[PDB]
Design a protein around this ligand. Sequence first.
Ligand code: PRP
Ligand code: PRP
Ligand code: 3F0
Ligand code: 3F0
Ligand code: MG
Ligand code: MG
Ligand code: MG
Ligand code: MG
Lengths: 347, 346
Amino acid sequence: VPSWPQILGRLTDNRDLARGQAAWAMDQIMTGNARPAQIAAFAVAMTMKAPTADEVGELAGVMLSHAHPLPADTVPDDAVDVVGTGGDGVNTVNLSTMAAIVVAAAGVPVVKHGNRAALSGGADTLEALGVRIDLGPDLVARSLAEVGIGFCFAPRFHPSYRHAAAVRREIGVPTVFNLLGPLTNPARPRAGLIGCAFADLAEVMAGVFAARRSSVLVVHGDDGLDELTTTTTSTIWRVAAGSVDKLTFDPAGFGFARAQLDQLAGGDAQANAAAVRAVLGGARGPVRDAVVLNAAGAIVAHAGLSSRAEWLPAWEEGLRRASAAIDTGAAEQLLARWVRFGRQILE
Amino acid sequence: PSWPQILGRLTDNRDLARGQAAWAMDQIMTGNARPAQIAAFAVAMTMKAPTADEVGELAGVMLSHAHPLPADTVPDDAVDVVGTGGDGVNTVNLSTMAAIVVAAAGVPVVKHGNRAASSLSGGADTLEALGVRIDLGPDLVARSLAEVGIGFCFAPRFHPSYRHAAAVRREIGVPTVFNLLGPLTNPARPRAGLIGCAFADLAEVMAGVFAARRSSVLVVHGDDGLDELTTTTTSTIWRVAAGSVDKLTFDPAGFGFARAQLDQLAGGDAQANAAAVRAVLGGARGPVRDAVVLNAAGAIVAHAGLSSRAEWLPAWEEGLRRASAAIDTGAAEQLLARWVRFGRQI
Ligand SMILES: O=P(O)(O)OC[C@H]1O[C@H](OP(=O)(O)OP(=O)(O)O)[C@H](O)[C@@H]1O
Ligand SMILES: O=P(O)(O)OC[C@H]1O[C@H](OP(=O)(O)OP(=O)(O)O)[C@H](O)[C@@H]1O
Ligand SMILES: Nc1c(F)cccc1C(=O)O
Ligand SMILES: Nc1c(F)cccc1C(=O)O
Ligand SMILES: [Mg+2]
Ligand SMILES: [Mg+2]
Ligand SMILES: [Mg+2]
Ligand SMILES: [Mg+2]
């Protein structure tokens, strides 16, 4: 007998939902049948109760069922995502976006799910670099084939999420909905480096990826970043073979100096675009270090699709590959090809 | 102050800073809060567990927007008999019947009330079915009180600015902190009350709110879940007076009441619950009468806590004698007839 009073009452009683209940709520939300008050009540109550992997998997699966897919056979079986929840409140340079370009230039297909900022988000910085972010399925697929990277603009691919997105903006507070972006990449890559700004939810995210048998590293810098940080240690939930394994990660062990958080600070889209250019041009410093680290992490997750290689050697090769992709010019070249691809669409 | 700040604080499981609940409630009451913001606030405050101070801000803000009764029309010793509802049992209208009995005993009653939310017939629905006019404005409620000894303030008529919150309450269905506010926002502001709370955890908070007012109240929760003094088992009573609270366990067997079953108090539609009122006021004996008498006496005890040095036990004994006598002498039946007549001569 599924209804808002039943489901909200259950959450306010601090109980886990029965199977199917989160799915019912999400189909109400995605069909436009949930009133803004019902959407908001649900988002908040799920959050304060503490969502489970099963519940979030129901939310994400329903949401994915409403998303526009890419055309059949256009996403390589070994594509990776590099993306985070955002909401770390630190306003850094676009680490996930830089790492994605490096990863793709290392020869790993990247299909990025992303969006604007909620100063300058991945999407905004890409636009300032000349990249066309609002392409439909056919052209993302083409971009992926021809350039080795594509970008799925969330509003383009998840039109039915617009009711939920407006509630999110109205209430402001982070909720369980902040987890859905990384879990609803419409290209469904099976590997990724996934940042989570909320330490208490990284494990849940990992659990959802583990139920899908994805090869993923869910990461949270112990300084609060939804990225692998160089300012201190990070916690990594390693997902492979459908099991989650919690780990502490210290970059110092690979020879990385401790950086300060303000060394990674970003600005507007133009500032962040120049930061991307600096790093791809091979400039040394904390930003490159951070990009290389996150790129290596994605490469490590990609490796887990076809092996269970030892952790430390996987990382060493990951960092080497990331570093080479920059220093051979491959990463700077890939960004140029990507811009060129978007400019060809007109004719 | 902002919604992101206040909501973040609540989702972090922190009590709000002084003034923040008031800011939120005033946004809600002025129509400046989006329905999503109203719902988030209501749910987050509920799951955090509201404090007495926070609820006092909510109710106090809500009262600042209400229509008052005209000056000098509510006696100093008027009493309310009302609860949160939401007890899920769909009993007969015990508070409403108790209110009639209390007025018939000679205690001024200004009842706050509203239609049913989850039950089949709320107090207002039942009063309407009895022929009492529930839709009177401040002036005529004050007249009812002077001329009949009882008045009824219908929440939608006295709290028009609460309409945005009320609608969100309906849309989400789940009980929230807002369900506490009815009993705390009687627009006539009576200083005494028998106030039922269906939520064991929140009764204490409601008592706290009354403690900070100039009030003599019994906040009551039946240990079977009723938002009334129950006859099926003990009740917890938060006795409020002089700015403090005395929590105690109350057992009506001490006054010779037989233990009843919950099903014996079950109500039906407005016509059914109206028939139950007429039966009780006509002298019919049984579990329902017993519960009405018990709650009427509770109200009379709260009233005595205003200007009477009577101690707890003697007060109860007197309250029970008065409540029973109001029924048996026909006074309560007569008062209801008078209340209906009053309404028809307008
Ligand atoms: O505005 P916020 O809520 O803080 O989120 C900042 C960014 O983090 C996420 O992107 P992603 O990880 O793809 O991009 P980035 O790390 O390259 O910025 C999100 O889609 C935003 O672009
Ligand atoms: O439908 P529910 O949410 O359970 O509410 C039942 C009733 O409880 C409250 O009234 P009150 O204590 O005045 O009425 P009573 O005579 O029914 O006790 C409320 O105003 C409802 O009328
Ligand atoms: N942010 C959005 C999204 F992620 C999906 C669909 C719509 C929106 C939106 O802001 O309208
Ligand atoms: N229940 C209401 C109330 F208590 C105040 C204002 C409006 C309503 C309503 O039911 O719409
Ligand atoms: Mg990121
Ligand atoms: Mg980030
Ligand atoms: Mg009642
Ligand atoms: Mg009741």
